[PDB]
Write a protein that binds this ligand. Structure first.
Ligand SMILES: Nc1ncnc2c1ncn2[C@@H]1O[C@H](COP(=O)(O)OP(=O)(O)CP(=O)(O)O)[C@@H](O)[C@H]1O
Ligand SMILES: [N-]=[N+]=NCC(=O)NCCCCN
Ligand SMILES: [Mg+2]
Ligand SMILES: [Mg+2]
Ligand SMILES: [Zn+2]
Length: 420
């Protein structure tokens, strides 16, 4: 029968990752029980959650097997031989679900991506639907496991993950930097967010001691595969393509959707600027705005680099839309849409019609003049100031992009200030 297998929490900060474990588990199924139908899914979840670092993404894949219990056994073996069970950080979870049963997990998954979950719940669910599972330590991996099975994908992107030969691991990666940029020129936007031009950093490569070499994001399999051959790196052992929820803002809740705001949730909301920009300590920029929910702290943190510039040009009265997560009672900006420019009427003194300099007052009510000529004028000129800010959309540079952050290149809207 056809069965969805879901895994996560199989990584420590040492040298495993959920996916590599999942890719192994896949290989073993292809050889013992049956075959993997389609692509595996790499479902990122609520990115604010504690003990998630780094990045919060479960895995799942569909199979055909004559016996369910066998499948589990094979999955169970895999976990035991590869998961860092030593680490109190990691507590693997796995689920096994009928084709026809997965639809029922859409709400649970949705909550896993936009909310916070107790293990109680996942346990209750597994009880309810008589779902075969594996919990190996704490059953925490079971939340993510279920979610990677229930997540419905309206929008989706692809990531071609390439893994190393295990000899190297914890070592550094040899790779051709230019060959990566060259690729991006040729195939953008079919392969987006794999390099930051403005900062000369290749983005699709981890610092971490994990098995990933590169994980390349894109739209088609044809694009992706083109990325591969075009890239020069130290040899590749395993390679899988995952259909993912990266770059879909799937984590975002809109202002029409709830009473209050909470920490550990991400939001899209419209706001008028109250406080103005003011730098803080590490290289940050703060400002408050006003909403249906009251006064709300919004920030661009130092790792946003340039993007701080477009924030620093914010004035009281600006109408804006913000995109980010709420932690420590403040919005960490992913994108921003300047909605209505706030117009500023001012009354400066008359410019002198000869020299160009500003006329100075000539008395209590004696108008203005320019002594360097014999020129004069009696009232003040009112204007609108013309600041360096165009309406529309602005995003953080790709090296500061969060996994779920939908980048401008993928929204068909107007006024998109894509910086390259
Ligand atoms: N919304 C949520 N509420 C509560 N717990 C959640 C949750 N989303 C995920 N979790 C759980 O927290 C744990 C996350 O730590 P984990 O190591 O598994 O990274 P996972 O997907 O985040 C990641 P990666 O491939 O980079 O290595 C998982 O057990 C997961 O099930
Ligand atoms: N493409 N890709 N893979 C991952 C990625 O985009 N990382 C972005 C940079 C995150 C900063 N630590
Ligand atoms: Mg996970
Ligand atoms: Mg873990
Ligand atoms: Zn003059």
């Amino acid at each position: 029968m056809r069965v969805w297998v879901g895994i996560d929490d199989t990584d420590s900060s040492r040298g495993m990752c959920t996916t590599y474990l999942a890719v192994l588990a896949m290989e073993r199924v292809e050889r013992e029980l049956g075959k993997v139908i389609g692509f595996p899914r790499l479902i990122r979840l609520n990115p604010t959650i504690p003990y998630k670092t780094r990045g919060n993404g479960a895995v799942s894949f569909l199979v055909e097997v004559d016996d369910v219990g066998e499948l589990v056994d094979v999955v169970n073996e895999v976990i035991i031989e590869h998961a860092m069970l030593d680490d109190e950080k990691t507590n693997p979870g796995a689920v096994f679900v009928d084709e026809e049963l997965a639809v029922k997990l859409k709400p649970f998954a949705d909550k896993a991506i936009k909310d916070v979950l107790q293990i109680d719940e996942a346990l209750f669910v597994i009880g309810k639907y008589f779902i075969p599972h594996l919990r190996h330590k704490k059953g925490r991996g079971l939340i993510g496991a279920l979610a990677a099975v229930g997540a419905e994908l309206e929008d989706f992107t692809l990531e071609l993950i390439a893994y190393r030969y295990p000899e190297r691991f914890g070592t550094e990666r040899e790779y051709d930097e230019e060959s990566f940029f060259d690729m991006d020129y040729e195939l953008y936007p079919q392969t987006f967010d794999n390099v930051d031009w403005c900062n000369d950093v290749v983005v699709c490569i981890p610092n971490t001691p994990c098995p990933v070499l590169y994980g390349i994001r894109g739209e088609s399999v044809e694009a992706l595969y083109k990325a591969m051959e075009s890239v020069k790196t130290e040899p590749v052992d395993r390679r899988m393509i995952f259909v993912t929820n990266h770059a879909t803002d799937m984590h975002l809740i809109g202002e029409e959707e709830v009473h209050r705001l909470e920490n550990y949730r991400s939001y899209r909301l419209r706001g008028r600027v109250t406080l103005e920009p003011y730098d803080i300590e590490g290289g940050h920029v703060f400002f408050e705005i006003d909403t249906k929910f009251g006064s709300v702290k919004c920030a661009a943190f130092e790792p946003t680099k340039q993007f701080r510039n477009v924030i620093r040009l914010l004035r009281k009265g600006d109408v804006v839309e913000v995109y980010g997560s709420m932690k420590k009672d403040t919005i960490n900006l992913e994108k921003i849409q300047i909605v209505e420019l706030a117009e500023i009427w001012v009354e400066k003194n008359p410019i002198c019609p000869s020299c160009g300099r500003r006329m100075e007052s000539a008395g209590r009510g004696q108008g203005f003049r320019c002594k360097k000529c014999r020129t004069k004028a009696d009232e003040k000129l009112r204007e609108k100031v013309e600041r360096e800010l165009q309406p529309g959309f602005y995003e953080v540079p790709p090296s500061a992009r969060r996994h779920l952050s939908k980048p401008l290149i993928r929204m068909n809207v107007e006024g998109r200030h894509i910086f390259r």
